[PDB]
Coordinates of N, CA and C and ligand atoms in Angstrom, one line a residue:
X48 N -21.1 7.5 -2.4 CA -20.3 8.0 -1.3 C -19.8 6.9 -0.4
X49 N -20.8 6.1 0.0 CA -20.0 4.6 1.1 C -19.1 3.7 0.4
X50 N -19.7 3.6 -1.1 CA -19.4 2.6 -1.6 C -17.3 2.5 -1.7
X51 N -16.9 4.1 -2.2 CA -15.9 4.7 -2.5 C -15.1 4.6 -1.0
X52 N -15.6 4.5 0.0 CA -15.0 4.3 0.9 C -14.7 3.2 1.8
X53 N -15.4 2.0 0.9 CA -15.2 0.6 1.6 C -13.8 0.1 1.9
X54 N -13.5 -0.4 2.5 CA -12.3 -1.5 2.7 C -12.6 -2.7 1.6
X55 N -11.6 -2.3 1.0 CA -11.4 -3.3 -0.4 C -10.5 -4.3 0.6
X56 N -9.4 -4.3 1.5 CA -8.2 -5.2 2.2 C -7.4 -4.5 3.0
X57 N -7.3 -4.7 4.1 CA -6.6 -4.4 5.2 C -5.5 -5.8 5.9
X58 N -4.6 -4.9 6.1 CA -3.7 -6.2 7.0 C -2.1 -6.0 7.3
X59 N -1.6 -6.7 7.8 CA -0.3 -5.7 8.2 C 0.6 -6.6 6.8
X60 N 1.7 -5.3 6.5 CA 2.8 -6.0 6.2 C 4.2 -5.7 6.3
X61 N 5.5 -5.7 5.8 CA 6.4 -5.0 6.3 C 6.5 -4.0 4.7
X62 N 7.3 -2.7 5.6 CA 7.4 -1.8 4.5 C 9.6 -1.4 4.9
X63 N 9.9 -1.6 3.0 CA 11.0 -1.3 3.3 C 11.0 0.0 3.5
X64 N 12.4 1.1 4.3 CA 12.8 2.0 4.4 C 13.3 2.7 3.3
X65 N 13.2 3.6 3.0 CA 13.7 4.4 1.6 C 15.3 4.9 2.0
X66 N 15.8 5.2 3.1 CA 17.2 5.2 3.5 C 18.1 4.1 4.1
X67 N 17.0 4.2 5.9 CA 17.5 3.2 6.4 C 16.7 2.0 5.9
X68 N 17.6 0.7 5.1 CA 16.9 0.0 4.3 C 16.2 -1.3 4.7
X69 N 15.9 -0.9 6.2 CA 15.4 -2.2 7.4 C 13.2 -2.0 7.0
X70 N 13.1 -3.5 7.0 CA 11.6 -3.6 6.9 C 11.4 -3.3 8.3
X71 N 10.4 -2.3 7.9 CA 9.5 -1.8 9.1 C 8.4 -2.8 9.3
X72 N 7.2 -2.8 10.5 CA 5.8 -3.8 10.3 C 5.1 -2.4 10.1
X73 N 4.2 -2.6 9.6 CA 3.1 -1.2 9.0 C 1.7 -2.2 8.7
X74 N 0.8 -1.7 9.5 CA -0.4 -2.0 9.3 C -1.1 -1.1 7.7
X75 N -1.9 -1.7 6.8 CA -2.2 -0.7 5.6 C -3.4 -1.3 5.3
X76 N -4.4 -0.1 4.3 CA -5.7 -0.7 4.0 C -6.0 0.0 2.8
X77 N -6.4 -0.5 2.4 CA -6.9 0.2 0.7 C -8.4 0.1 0.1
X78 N -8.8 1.6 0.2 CA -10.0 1.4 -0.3 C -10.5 1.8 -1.4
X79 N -11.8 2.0 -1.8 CA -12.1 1.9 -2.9 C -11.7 3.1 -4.0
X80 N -11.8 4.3 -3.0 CA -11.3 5.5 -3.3 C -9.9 5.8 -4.1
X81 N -9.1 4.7 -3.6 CA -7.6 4.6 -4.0 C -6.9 4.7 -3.2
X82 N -7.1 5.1 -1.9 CA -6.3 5.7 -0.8 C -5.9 4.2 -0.4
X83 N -4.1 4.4 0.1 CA -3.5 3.1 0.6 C -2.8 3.5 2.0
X84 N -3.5 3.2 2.6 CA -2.8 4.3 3.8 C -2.3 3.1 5.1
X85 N -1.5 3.2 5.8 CA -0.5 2.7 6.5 C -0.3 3.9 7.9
X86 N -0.4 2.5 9.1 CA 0.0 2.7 10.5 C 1.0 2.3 11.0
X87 N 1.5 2.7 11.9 CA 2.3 2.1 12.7 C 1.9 1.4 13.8
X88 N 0.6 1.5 14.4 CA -0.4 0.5 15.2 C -1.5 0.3 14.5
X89 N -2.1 -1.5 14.8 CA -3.4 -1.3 14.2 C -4.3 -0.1 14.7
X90 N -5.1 0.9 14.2 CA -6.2 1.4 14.6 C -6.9 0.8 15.3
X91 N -7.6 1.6 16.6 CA -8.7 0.6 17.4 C -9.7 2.0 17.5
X92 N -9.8 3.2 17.2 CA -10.8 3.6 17.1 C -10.9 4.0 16.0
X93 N -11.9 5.2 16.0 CA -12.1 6.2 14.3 C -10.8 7.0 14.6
X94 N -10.6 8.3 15.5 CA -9.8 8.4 15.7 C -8.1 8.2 15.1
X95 N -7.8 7.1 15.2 CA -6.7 6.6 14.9 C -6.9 6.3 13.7
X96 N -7.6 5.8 13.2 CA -8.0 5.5 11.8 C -7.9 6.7 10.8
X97 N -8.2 8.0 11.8 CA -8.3 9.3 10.4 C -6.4 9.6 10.8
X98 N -5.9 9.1 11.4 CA -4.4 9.6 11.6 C -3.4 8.8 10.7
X99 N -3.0 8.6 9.4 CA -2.4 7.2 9.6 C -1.1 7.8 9.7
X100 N 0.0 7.3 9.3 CA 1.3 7.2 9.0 C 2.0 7.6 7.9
X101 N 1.4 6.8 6.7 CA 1.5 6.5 5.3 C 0.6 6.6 4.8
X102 N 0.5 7.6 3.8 CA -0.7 7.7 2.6 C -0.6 7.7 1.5
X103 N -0.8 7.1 0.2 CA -0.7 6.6 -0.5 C -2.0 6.9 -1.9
X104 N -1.8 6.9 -3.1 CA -2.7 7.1 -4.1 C -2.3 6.1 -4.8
X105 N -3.4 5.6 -5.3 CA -2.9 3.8 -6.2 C -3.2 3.8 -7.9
X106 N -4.2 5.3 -7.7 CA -4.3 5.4 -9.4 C -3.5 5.4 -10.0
X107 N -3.2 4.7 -11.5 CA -2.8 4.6 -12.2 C -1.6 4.2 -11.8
X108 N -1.5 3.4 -10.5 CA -0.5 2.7 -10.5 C 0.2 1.9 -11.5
X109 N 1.8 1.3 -11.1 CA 1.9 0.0 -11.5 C 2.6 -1.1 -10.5
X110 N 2.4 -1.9 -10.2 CA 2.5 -3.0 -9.9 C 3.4 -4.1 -9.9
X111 N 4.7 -4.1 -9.0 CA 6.1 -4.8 -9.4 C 5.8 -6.2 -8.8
X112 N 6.7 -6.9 -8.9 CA 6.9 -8.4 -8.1 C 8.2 -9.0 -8.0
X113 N 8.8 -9.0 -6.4 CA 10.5 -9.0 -7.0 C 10.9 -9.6 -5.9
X114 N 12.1 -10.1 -6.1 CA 12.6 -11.9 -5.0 C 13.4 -11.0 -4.9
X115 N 13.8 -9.8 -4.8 CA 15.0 -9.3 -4.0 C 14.9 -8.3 -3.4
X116 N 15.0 -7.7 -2.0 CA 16.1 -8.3 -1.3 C 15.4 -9.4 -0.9
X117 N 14.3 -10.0 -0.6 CA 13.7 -10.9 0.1 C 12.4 -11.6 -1.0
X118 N 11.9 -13.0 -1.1 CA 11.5 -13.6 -1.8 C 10.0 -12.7 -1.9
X119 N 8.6 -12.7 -2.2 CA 7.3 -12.3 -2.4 C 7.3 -10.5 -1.7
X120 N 8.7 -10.2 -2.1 CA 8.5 -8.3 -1.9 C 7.3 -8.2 -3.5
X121 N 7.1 -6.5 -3.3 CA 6.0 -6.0 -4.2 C 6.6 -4.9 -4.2
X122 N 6.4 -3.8 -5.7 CA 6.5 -2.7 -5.4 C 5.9 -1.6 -6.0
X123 N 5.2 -1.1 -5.4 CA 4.5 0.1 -5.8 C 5.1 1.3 -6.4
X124 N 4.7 1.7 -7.5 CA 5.0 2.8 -8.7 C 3.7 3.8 -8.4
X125 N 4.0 5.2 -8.0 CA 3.1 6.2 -8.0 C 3.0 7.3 -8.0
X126 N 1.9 8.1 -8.3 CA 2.2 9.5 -8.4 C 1.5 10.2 -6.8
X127 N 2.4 10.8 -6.4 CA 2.6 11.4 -5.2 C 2.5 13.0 -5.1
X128 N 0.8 13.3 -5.7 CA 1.0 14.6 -6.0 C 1.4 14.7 -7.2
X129 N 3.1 15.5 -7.4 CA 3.7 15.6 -8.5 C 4.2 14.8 -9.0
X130 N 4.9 13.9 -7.5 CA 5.9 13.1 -7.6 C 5.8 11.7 -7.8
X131 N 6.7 11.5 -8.8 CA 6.2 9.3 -9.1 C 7.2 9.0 -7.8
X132 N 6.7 8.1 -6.7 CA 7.5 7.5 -6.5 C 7.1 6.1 -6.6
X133 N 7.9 5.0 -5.7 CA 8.3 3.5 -5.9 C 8.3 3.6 -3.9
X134 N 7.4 2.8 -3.4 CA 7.2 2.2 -2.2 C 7.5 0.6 -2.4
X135 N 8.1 0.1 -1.4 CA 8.7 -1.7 -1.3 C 7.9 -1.9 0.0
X136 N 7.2 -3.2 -0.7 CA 6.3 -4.1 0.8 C 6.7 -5.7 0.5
X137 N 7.1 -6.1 1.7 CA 6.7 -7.9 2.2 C 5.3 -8.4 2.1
X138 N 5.3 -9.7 2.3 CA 4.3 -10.4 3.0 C 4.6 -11.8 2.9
X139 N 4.6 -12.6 3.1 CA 5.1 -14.3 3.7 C 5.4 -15.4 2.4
X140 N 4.3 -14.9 1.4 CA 4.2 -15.4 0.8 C 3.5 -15.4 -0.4
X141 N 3.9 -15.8 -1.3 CA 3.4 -15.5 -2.9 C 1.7 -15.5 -3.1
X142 N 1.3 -16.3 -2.5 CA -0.6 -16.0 -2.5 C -1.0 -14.8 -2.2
X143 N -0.5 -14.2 -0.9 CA -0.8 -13.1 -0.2 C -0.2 -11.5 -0.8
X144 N 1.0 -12.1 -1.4 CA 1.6 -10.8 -2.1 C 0.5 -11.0 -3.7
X145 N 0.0 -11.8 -4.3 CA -1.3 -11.6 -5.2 C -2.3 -11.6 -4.7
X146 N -2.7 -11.3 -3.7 CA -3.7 -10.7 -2.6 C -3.5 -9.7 -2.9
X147 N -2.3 -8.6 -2.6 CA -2.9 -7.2 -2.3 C -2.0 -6.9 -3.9
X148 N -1.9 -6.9 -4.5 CA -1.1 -6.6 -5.7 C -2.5 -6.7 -6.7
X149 N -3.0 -7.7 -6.7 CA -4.6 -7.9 -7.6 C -5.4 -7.0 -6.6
X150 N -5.7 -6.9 -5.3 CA -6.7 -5.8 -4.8 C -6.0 -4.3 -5.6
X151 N -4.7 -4.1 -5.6 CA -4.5 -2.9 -5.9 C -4.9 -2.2 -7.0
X152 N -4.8 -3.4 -7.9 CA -5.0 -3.4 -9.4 C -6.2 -3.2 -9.4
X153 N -7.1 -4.0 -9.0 CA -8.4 -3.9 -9.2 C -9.3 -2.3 -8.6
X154 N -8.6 -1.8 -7.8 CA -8.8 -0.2 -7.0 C -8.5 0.3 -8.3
X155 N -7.3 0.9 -8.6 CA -6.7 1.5 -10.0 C -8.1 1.5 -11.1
X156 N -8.4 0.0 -11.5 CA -9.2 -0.1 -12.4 C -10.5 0.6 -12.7
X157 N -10.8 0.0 -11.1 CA -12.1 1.0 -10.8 C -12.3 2.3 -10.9
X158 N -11.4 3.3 -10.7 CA -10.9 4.9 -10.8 C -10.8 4.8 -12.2
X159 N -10.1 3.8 -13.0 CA -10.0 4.2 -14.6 C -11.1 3.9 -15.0
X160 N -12.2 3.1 -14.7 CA -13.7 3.1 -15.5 C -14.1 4.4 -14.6
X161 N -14.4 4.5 -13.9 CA -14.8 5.9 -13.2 C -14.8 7.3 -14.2
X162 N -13.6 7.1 -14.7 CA -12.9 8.2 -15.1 C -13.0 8.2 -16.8
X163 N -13.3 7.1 -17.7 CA -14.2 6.8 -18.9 C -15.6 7.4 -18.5
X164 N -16.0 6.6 -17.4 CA -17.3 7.7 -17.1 C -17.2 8.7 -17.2
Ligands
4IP354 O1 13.3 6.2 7.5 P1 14.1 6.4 6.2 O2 14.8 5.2 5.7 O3 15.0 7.6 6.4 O4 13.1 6.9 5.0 C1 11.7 7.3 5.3 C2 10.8 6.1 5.4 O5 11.0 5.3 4.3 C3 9.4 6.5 5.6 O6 8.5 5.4 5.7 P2 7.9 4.8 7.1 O7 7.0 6.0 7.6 O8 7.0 3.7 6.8 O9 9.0 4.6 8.1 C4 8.9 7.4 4.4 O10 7.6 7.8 4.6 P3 6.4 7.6 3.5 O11 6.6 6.2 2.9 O12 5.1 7.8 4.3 O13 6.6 8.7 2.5 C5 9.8 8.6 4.3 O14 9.5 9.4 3.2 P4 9.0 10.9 3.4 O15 7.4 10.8 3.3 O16 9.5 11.6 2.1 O17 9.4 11.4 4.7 C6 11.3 8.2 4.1 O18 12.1 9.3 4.0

């Protein structure tokens, strides 16, 4: 039960717009559960924490890496419910975008040995 709910990595990054195509800043956290969920302020209580923004499922994700429009973007492939979609995130720099791109993977993984179980 706790374990599934840990903070695997939290931290802000920017998230492209799916219309208007301007990077937003979006705080996001991903835990063990799969849940990738995204604020528009950091959380400072529980509260705000059960509210987010953006919610997200990472199972069986996949995992992009792309220098356009901007160098160390990422892009997430997912199922949304029914729907696959494709989310676009920033972050400064190439370390940090395999920071949360290997945390993601590594969440995914976990749900697929889960699910062998
Ligand atoms: O603002 P524009 O360019 O019109 O497009 C919006 C933003 O991309 C939203 O992201 P953000 O909340 O980070 O601004 C997104 O929410 P999600 O990424 O949470 O899905 C909306 O998807 P919908 O969920 O279909 O409304 C999408 O329609």
């Amino acid at each position: 039960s706790m374990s599934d709910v840990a903070i695997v990595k939290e931290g802000w990054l920017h998230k492209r717009g799916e219309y208007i195509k301007t990077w937003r800043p979006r705080y996001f956290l991903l835990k063990n559960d799969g849940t990738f969920i995204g604020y528009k302020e950091r959380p400072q209580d529980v509260d705000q924490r059960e509210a987010p923004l953006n919610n997200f499922s990472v199972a069986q994700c996949q995992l992009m890496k792309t220098e356009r429009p901007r160098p160390n973007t990422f892009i997430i492939r997912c199922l949304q419910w029914t729907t696959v979609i494709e989310r676009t995130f920033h972050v400064e720099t190439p370390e940090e975008r395999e920071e949360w791109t290997t945390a993601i993977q590594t969440v995914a993984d976990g749900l697929k040995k889960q699910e062998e179980e």
